[PDB]
Design a protein around this nucleic acid. Structure first.
Lengths: 185, 111, 56, 144
RNA sequence: AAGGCAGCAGGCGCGCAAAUUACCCAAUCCUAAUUCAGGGAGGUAGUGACAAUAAAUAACGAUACAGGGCCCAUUCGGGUCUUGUAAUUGGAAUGAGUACAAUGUAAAUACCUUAACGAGGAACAAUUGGAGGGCAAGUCUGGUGCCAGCAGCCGCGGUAAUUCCAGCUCCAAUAGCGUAUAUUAAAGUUGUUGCAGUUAAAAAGCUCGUAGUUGAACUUUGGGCCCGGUUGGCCGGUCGGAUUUCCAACG
């Protein structure tokens, strides 16, 4: 009798289960991006299929429809802000050409790797979830953070993390401890 | 080959050698797949890796006279008990995968 | 089998033969025997010219 | 043309004609006759518990020549007697008379499966544990 | 004499099928004579793989064999190009957990913080189904011999089983995966969109006929501005036809 909590699922399983085209198209999306499983790839195509349904709905409507104009710019400026639509590609005919590749680029698990400091795309994944990377002032350990356009200057090591200073962690701290009790005294 | 450069050469380029392999995934390796063309285009007879002169004689005893039988030995390397039979003295064309499992299952370091 | 045998017939045709024919018979890839024949050109096998122009 | 009415004031005829021809459909009839409640051995349920009465051997139909090792079971909630197949080998040793098995459908929504004639059910649990566990020696049948 | 849990918690029964005889009015609100009292309404906690979200099970390095093709070649070599097998080592990072504290809270638990501990294959060890086709992945080995069994379907098994029972290897999804029943898509196999009826299932033996469904044609053009013609001429330029403009209105 308390009001319900809305919830939804954020992915979709493909219709035909065993392909050789789709199953091997995961070469890029799992080895070249360093991903857990196919649900991280099914998640992206779900949002991307959610985008085209709204865009197809708008294109059917008349040009200079106030509904087309309002939700059109809103859909563009949301996709511009996260950096999946390029700086001037801003047209509803180009959000339909938007593919799965330039969503995984904007993930923080790759944006760490492209901005140096990671030396592997799934060395970055380990560093993120080990509470090392902070955006602005906030530590994030979610590898699917989907950074914005005014945020790439703010991926840096955390003020708490050992690689951002602040008294290195329990491995080196204990390792220096046993040389203190063996060599120091 | 194996992690020597395939991560070091992937510094923000992410595509050099990303093509698909031959594609069996349970059929054995292509260690003679190069030699298979050479015996196909050369219009004469060529000798196929003739014999096993001392890797037969010496390593049959070190493997099998120790404890084991070929019916046992071929069962742990997963080959028919006549395959090991023709690796005993002579009369085989030695391929790499069978001779590798022969080595790692019974230790004697003769290739 | 199909590659080793087509590489023999095409070599004999390259050597100025008018016709040659290669038969492989046995258990080729199954437990029940079959027979595959590979041919090019033409062959005569009728009479005295067999003793003249055929090598087997 | 086309044998059906087309006039704009003819929705009643099309609606009643669709209704009459729905009865030729196999599952529409069973949904609206309640055949699952009255006629099916399970009372329109996925599963039912039973009581084992006898071990049965059923000859597999052509072109197979095995003996299928099933049992005869009487249900609790209905009292009806059904024959249920006992899966992969040794499980007929794990089942005995009066073990209070649990039954499921045999895959084909009320039809026989494979070469077994006239068996529409299979045993899932015996004595309340499993058959997978007993077959894989993961659990033990209670002493009864 | 007394009774009515389809209130809360719990029990029996029924079944394929469903939680604690816990804490509190601190929030949301309700009632009363009413700021104060009361509230199993309600909230908090326990059980809870119903569903849903996010995402640990490792990351950097160093180290080697065995081939094969080709080239140059003395023959002993390189000097590329690729094939497989690991196998021994190093410092770094972290939370899952154990917890001073504080925070949280009506009081707690838990989360979010955080002192102190907490990783080297023995563990802090991921499973569930598959490997003939549909359908991704072994014609590898041992056992059985139309037996045991598998198999949604086609099929497999009668002494060389790619299909059973195993070992190895591999595939798919993954903290989830299989099975059963129902239902939706598939299904243009319910057809208004949009089926079919000579022979595959299906045109009543034939005709009349009420309801129902369906039913030939016919009844006048006021605002202005830009565009195309088609007639009417002012206009022939020209050796009976050749360009169109300014003006009606003719729609």
């Amino acid at each position: 009798p308390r009001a319900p909590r809305t919830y939804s699922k954020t992915y979709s399983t493909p219709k035909r289960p065993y392909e050789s085209s789709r199953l091997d198209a995961e070469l890029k999306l799992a080895g070249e991006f360093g991903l857990k499983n196919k649900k991280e790839i099914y998640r992206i195509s779900f949002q991307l299929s959610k985008i085209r349904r709204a865009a197809r709905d708008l294109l059917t409507r008349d040009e200079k429809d106030p509904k087309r104009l309002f939700e059109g710019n809103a859909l563009i400026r949301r996709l511009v802000r996260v950096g999946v639509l390029s700086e001037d590609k801003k047209k509803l005919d180009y959000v339909l050409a938007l593919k799965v590749e330039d969503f995984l680029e904007r993930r923080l698990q790759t944006q760490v790797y492209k901005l140096g400091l990671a030396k592997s795309v799934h060395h970055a994944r380990v560093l993120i979830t080990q509470r090392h990377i902070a955006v602005g002032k906030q530590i994030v350990n979610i590898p699917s953070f989907m950074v914005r356009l005014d945020s790439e200057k703010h991926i840096d090591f955390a003020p708490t993390s050992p690689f951002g200073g602040a008294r290195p962690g329990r491995v080196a701290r204990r390792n220096a401890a046993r040389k203190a009790e063996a060599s120091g005294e | 080959r194996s992690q020597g450069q395939i991560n070091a050469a992937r510094r923000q380029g992410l595509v050099v050698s990303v093509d698909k392999k031959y594609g069996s995934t349970n059929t054995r390796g292509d260690n003679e797949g190069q030699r298979l063309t050479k015996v196909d285009r050369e219009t004469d007879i060529v000798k196929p890796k003739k014999l096993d002169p001392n890797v037969g004689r010496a390593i049959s005893r070190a493997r099998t006279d120790k404890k084991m039988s070929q019916k046992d030995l071929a069962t742990k390397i997963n080959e028919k008990p006549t395959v090991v039979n023709d690796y005993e003295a002579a009369r085989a064309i030695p391929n790499q995968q069978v001779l590798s499992k022969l080595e790692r299952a019974l230790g004697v370091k003769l290739r | 089998i199909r590659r080793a045998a087509y590489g023999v017939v095409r070599y004999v045709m390259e050597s100025g033969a008018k016709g040659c024919e290669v038969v492989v018979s046995g258990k080729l890839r199954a437990a029940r025997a079959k027979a595959m024949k590979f041919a090019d050109g033409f062959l005569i096998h009728s009479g005295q010219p067999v003793n003249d122009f055929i090598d087997t | 043309g086309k044998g059906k009415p087309r006039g704009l004031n003819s929705a009643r005829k099309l609606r009643v004609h669709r209704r009459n021809n729905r009865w030729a459909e196999n599952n529409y009839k069973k949904r609206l006759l309640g055949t699952a409640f009255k006629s099916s051995p399970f009372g329109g349920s996925s599963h039912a518990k039973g009581i084992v009465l006898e071990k049965l051997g059923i000859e597999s139909k052509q072109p197979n020549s095995a003996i299928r090792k099933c049992v005869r079971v009487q249900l609790i909630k209905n009292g009806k007697k059904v024959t249920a197949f006992v899966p992969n080998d040794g499980c007929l040793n794990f089942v005995d008379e009066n073990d209070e098995v649990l039954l499921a459908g045999f895959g084909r929504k009320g039809k026989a499966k494979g070469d077994i004639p006239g068996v529409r059910f299979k045993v899932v649990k015996v004595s309340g544990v499993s058959l997978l566990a007993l077959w894989k020696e993961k659990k033990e049948k209670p002493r009864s």
